[PDB]
Design a protein around this motif. Structure first.
Motif, PDB file in Angstrom:
ATOM      1  N   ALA A   1       3.743   5.276 -30.806  1.00 24.89           N
ATOM      2  CA  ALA A   1       4.206   4.507 -29.656  1.00 24.89           C
ATOM      3  C   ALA A   1       4.691   5.423 -28.541  1.00 24.89           C
ATOM      4  O   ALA A   1       4.419   5.169 -27.364  1.00 24.89           O
ATOM      5  N   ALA A   2       5.393   6.507 -28.889  1.00 28.75           N
ATOM      6  CA  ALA A   2       5.883   7.420 -27.863  1.00 28.75           C
ATOM      7  C   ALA A   2       4.728   8.143 -27.180  1.00 28.75           C
ATOM      8  O   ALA A   2       4.754   8.352 -25.962  1.00 28.75           O
ATOM      9  N   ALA A   3       3.727   8.561 -27.962  1.00 23.65           N
ATOM     10  CA  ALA A   3       2.538   9.205 -27.408  1.00 23.65           C
ATOM     11  C   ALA A   3       1.796   8.278 -26.451  1.00 23.65           C
ATOM     12  O   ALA A   3       1.372   8.707 -25.375  1.00 23.65           O
ATOM     13  N   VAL A   4       1.660   6.997 -26.804  1.00 24.00           N
ATOM     14  CA  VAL A   4       0.929   6.067 -25.940  1.00 24.00           C
ATOM     15  C   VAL A   4       1.767   5.653 -24.742  1.00 24.00           C
ATOM     16  O   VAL A   4       1.272   5.623 -23.612  1.00 24.00           O
ATOM     17  N   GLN A   5       3.035   5.284 -24.979  1.00 24.33           N
ATOM     18  CA  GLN A   5       3.819   4.564 -23.975  1.00 24.33           C
ATOM     19  C   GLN A   5       4.657   5.464 -23.081  1.00 24.33           C
ATOM     20  O   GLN A   5       5.045   5.037 -21.983  1.00 24.33           O
ATOM     21  N   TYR A   6       4.948   6.681 -23.525  1.00 22.71           N
ATOM     22  CA  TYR A   6       5.677   7.651 -22.731  1.00 22.71           C
ATOM     23  C   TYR A   6       4.897   8.939 -22.567  1.00 22.71           C
ATOM     24  O   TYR A   6       5.402   9.878 -21.942  1.00 22.71           O
ATOM     25  N   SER A   7       3.678   9.006 -23.115  1.00 20.02           N
ATOM     26  CA  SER A   7       2.831  10.195 -23.041  1.00 20.02           C
ATOM     27  C   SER A   7       3.539  11.416 -23.641  1.00 20.02           C
ATOM     28  O   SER A   7       3.347  12.556 -23.206  1.00 20.02           O
ATOM     29  N   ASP A   8       4.388  11.178 -24.636  1.00 25.15           N
ATOM     30  CA  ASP A   8       5.225  12.219 -25.227  1.00 25.15           C
ATOM     31  C   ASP A   8       4.365  13.329 -25.834  1.00 25.15           C
ATOM     32  O   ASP A   8       3.572  13.077 -26.742  1.00 25.15           O
ATOM     33  N   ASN A   9       4.579  14.566 -25.371  1.00 23.33           N
ATOM     34  CA  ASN A   9       3.708  15.676 -25.766  1.00 23.33           C
ATOM     35  C   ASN A   9       3.988  16.148 -27.187  1.00 23.33           C
ATOM     36  O   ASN A   9       3.051  16.394 -27.957  1.00 23.33           O
TER      37      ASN A   9
ATOM     38  N   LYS B   1      -0.382  -2.127 -23.827  1.00 27.35           N
ATOM     39  CA  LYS B   1       0.284  -3.061 -22.927  1.00 27.35           C
ATOM     40  C   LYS B   1       1.696  -2.608 -22.585  1.00 27.35           C
ATOM     41  O   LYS B   1       2.176  -2.875 -21.479  1.00 27.35           O
ATOM     42  N   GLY B   2       2.377  -1.938 -23.514  1.00 30.00           N
ATOM     43  CA  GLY B   2       3.717  -1.450 -23.285  1.00 30.00           C
ATOM     44  C   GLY B   2       3.809  -0.093 -22.626  1.00 30.00           C
ATOM     45  O   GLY B   2       4.905   0.473 -22.553  1.00 30.00           O
ATOM     46  N   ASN B   3       2.699   0.465 -22.146  1.00 34.25           N
ATOM     47  CA  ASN B   3       2.774   1.772 -21.511  1.00 34.25           C
ATOM     48  C   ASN B   3       3.688   1.723 -20.289  1.00 34.25           C
ATOM     49  O   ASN B   3       3.636   0.779 -19.492  1.00 34.25           O
ATOM     50  N   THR B   4       4.488   2.780 -20.116  1.00 31.41           N
ATOM     51  CA  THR B   4       5.422   2.871 -19.000  1.00 31.41           C
ATOM     52  C   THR B   4       4.976   3.829 -17.904  1.00 31.41           C
ATOM     53  O   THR B   4       5.618   3.873 -16.852  1.00 31.41           O
ATOM     54  N   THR B   5       3.918   4.612 -18.120  1.00 30.91           N
ATOM     55  CA  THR B   5       3.580   5.703 -17.214  1.00 30.91           C
ATOM     56  C   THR B   5       2.480   5.364 -16.219  1.00 30.91           C
ATOM     57  O   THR B   5       2.086   6.239 -15.446  1.00 30.91           O
TER      58      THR B   5
ATOM     59  N   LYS C   1      -4.307  10.690 -25.878  1.00 33.68           N
ATOM     60  CA  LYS C   1      -3.238  10.216 -26.753  1.00 33.68           C
ATOM     61  C   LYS C   1      -3.441   8.761 -27.149  1.00 33.68           C
ATOM     62  O   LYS C   1      -2.970   8.336 -28.207  1.00 33.68           O
ATOM     63  N   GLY C   2      -4.112   7.971 -26.308  1.00 32.48           N
ATOM     64  CA  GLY C   2      -4.447   6.621 -26.719  1.00 32.48           C
ATOM     65  C   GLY C   2      -5.421   6.609 -27.880  1.00 32.48           C
ATOM     66  O   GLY C   2      -5.210   5.919 -28.882  1.00 32.48           O
ATOM     67  N   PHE C   3      -6.496   7.397 -27.768  1.00 30.55           N
ATOM     68  CA  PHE C   3      -7.460   7.484 -28.861  1.00 30.55           C
ATOM     69  C   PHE C   3      -6.826   8.070 -30.111  1.00 30.55           C
ATOM     70  O   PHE C   3      -7.175   7.668 -31.227  1.00 30.55           O
TER      71      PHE C   3
ATOM     72  N   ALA D   1      -0.288  -9.858 -11.095  1.00 31.51           N
ATOM     73  CA  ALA D   1       0.849  -9.952 -12.008  1.00 31.51           C
ATOM     74  C   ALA D   1       0.587 -10.897 -13.172  1.00 31.51           C
ATOM     75  O   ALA D   1       1.176 -10.727 -14.243  1.00 31.51           O
ATOM     76  N   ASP D   2      -0.267 -11.904 -12.990  1.00 32.50           N
ATOM     77  CA  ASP D   2      -0.493 -12.871 -14.053  1.00 32.50           C
ATOM     78  C   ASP D   2      -1.621 -12.474 -14.996  1.00 32.50           C
ATOM     79  O   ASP D   2      -1.951 -13.248 -15.897  1.00 32.50           O
ATOM     80  N   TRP D   3      -2.195 -11.282 -14.829  1.00 30.77           N
ATOM     81  CA  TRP D   3      -3.213 -10.763 -15.736  1.00 30.77           C
ATOM     82  C   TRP D   3      -2.585  -9.749 -16.680  1.00 30.77           C
ATOM     83  O   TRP D   3      -1.858  -8.850 -16.240  1.00 30.77           O
ATOM     84  N   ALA D   4      -2.891  -9.868 -17.967  1.00 30.88           N
ATOM     85  CA  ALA D   4      -2.413  -8.880 -18.923  1.00 30.88           C
ATOM     86  C   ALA D   4      -3.205  -7.581 -18.776  1.00 30.88           C
ATOM     87  O   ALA D   4      -4.385  -7.582 -18.406  1.00 30.88           O
ATOM     88  N   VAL D   5      -2.542  -6.463 -19.056  1.00 33.39           N
ATOM     89  CA  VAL D   5      -3.167  -5.150 -18.907  1.00 33.39           C
ATOM     90  C   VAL D   5      -2.491  -4.160 -19.841  1.00 33.39           C
ATOM     91  O   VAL D   5      -1.266  -4.160 -19.994  1.00 33.39           O
ATOM     92  N   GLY D   6      -3.304  -3.341 -20.497  1.00 36.29           N
ATOM     93  CA  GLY D   6      -2.808  -2.173 -21.195  1.00 36.29           C
ATOM     94  C   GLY D   6      -3.568  -0.959 -20.713  1.00 36.29           C
ATOM     95  O   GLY D   6      -4.734  -1.050 -20.347  1.00 36.29           O
ATOM     96  N   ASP D   7      -2.887   0.189 -20.693  1.00 33.46           N
ATOM     97  CA  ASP D   7      -3.513   1.386 -20.138  1.00 33.46           C
ATOM     98  C   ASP D   7      -2.968   2.643 -20.802  1.00 33.46           C
ATOM     99  O   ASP D   7      -1.920   2.627 -21.452  1.00 33.46           O
TER     100      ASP D   7
END
Ligand SMILES: Cc1cc(C)c2c(CP(=O)(O)O)cc(=O)oc2c1
Ligand SMILES: Cc1cc(C)c2c(CP(=O)(O)O)cc(=O)oc2c1
Ligand SMILES: Cc1cc(C)c2c(CP(=O)(O)O)cc(=O)oc2c1
Length: 270
Positions: free
Chosen positions: A101-109, A189-193, A50-52, A204-210
């Protein structure tokens, strides 16, 4: 070669405790140093496609102005399990950007399937990945059929190395134009899952998106990420797991532990 040899023993111990296979590829984009463990094996993508998918939408938005603002309406039949955002807008619709955004950040199917349709289905997403030079990625099916994670089945798989290489190109390289690249980064970066996966290994002080994936059978789950340590170049990494038996459970702690080992292998203190 040296860093890959350095982590071979701890990775073997981790996957033996897990009871399955762990695949890792991690790239220090500054030096170019890499850590590999089963990095060429195929693992099921699960939701990590879903990210790709969102990157492919963003690439198309470079060619079609206003694509991101297009409203998409859908029926109750689209609301397959785990559609936490799209189910709230069933009576209203959502925009392409909101679906992405929903697909990336909530993995919405449902959101993922609706965007797949706009892009020409699994073959369309595969074509986008080929266009950026990824000859390994393949998407064959839709949610949730792509979760089957059958041992030896190449459908809906990639390798940790190819995932990392493509992620680098899309978030740090030139595969997307600068505005679209930053939007992709911001969505990741805004992923919640993924709080219990790669992020659990990141200070905590390093930025990360996944972006996560969980097939729910055959111990199959994964996460890929871009990590921005302070004061050094970003790291890109992919962590995928599977296991031999259908009833084997995945482990988020194993994914986090594999991410820790990869970062330690790259010499990134944290
Ligand atoms: C929104 C959506 C969802 C699915 C699953 C499809 C499918 C696969 P199916 O529903 O036939 O099992 C093909 C398609 O062309 O559009 C879709 C759109
Ligand atoms: C879904 C998708 C998006 C894009 C941007 C492509 C590209 C770039 P294109 O040459 O079409 O402009 C190549 C391709 O084959 O598949 C895609 C699929
Ligand atoms: C049925 C289902 C669907 C999803 C998307 C998940 C996820 C999110 P993913 O890791 O695929 O992105 C986590 C999980 O544990 O169970 C799920 C079950």
């Amino acid at each position: 070669h040296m860093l890959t040899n350095l982590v071979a023993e701890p990775f073997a111990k981790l996957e033996q405790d897990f009871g399955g296979s762990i695949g890792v590829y991690a790239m220090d984009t500054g030096s170019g140093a890499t850590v590999s463990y089963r990095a060429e094996e195929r693992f099921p993508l699960c939701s990590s496609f879903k990210g790709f998918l969102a990157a492919a939408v963003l690439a198309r938005s470079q060619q079609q102005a206003g694509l991101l603002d297009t409203p998409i309406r859908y029926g109750k039949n689209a609301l397959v399990p785990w559609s936490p955002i799209s189910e709230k807008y069933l009576t209203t619709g959502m925009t392409v950007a909101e679906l992405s955004a929903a697909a990336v950040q909530y993995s919405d199917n449902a959101a993922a399937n609706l965007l797949l349709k706009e892009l020409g289905g699994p073959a369309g997403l595969t074509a986008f990945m080929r266009s950026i030079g990824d000859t390994t990625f393949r998407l064959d099916r839709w949610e949730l059929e792509l979760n089957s994670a059958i041992p030896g089945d190449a459908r809906d798989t990639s390798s940790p190395r190819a995932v990392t290489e493509s992620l680098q190109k899309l978030t740090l390289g030139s595969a997307l134009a600068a505005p679209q690249r930053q939007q992709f980064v911001d969505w990741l970066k805004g992923n919640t899952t993924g709080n219990h996966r790669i992020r659990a290994a990141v200070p905590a002080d390093w930025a990360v998106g996944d972006k996560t994936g969980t097939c729910g059978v055959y111990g199959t789950a994964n996460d890929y990420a871009v990590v921005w340590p302070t004061g050094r170049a970003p790291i890109v990494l992919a962590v995928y797991t599977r296991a031999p038996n259908k009833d084997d459970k995945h482990s988020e702690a194993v994914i986090a532990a594999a991410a820790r080992l990869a970062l330690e292998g790259l010499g990134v203190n944290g």
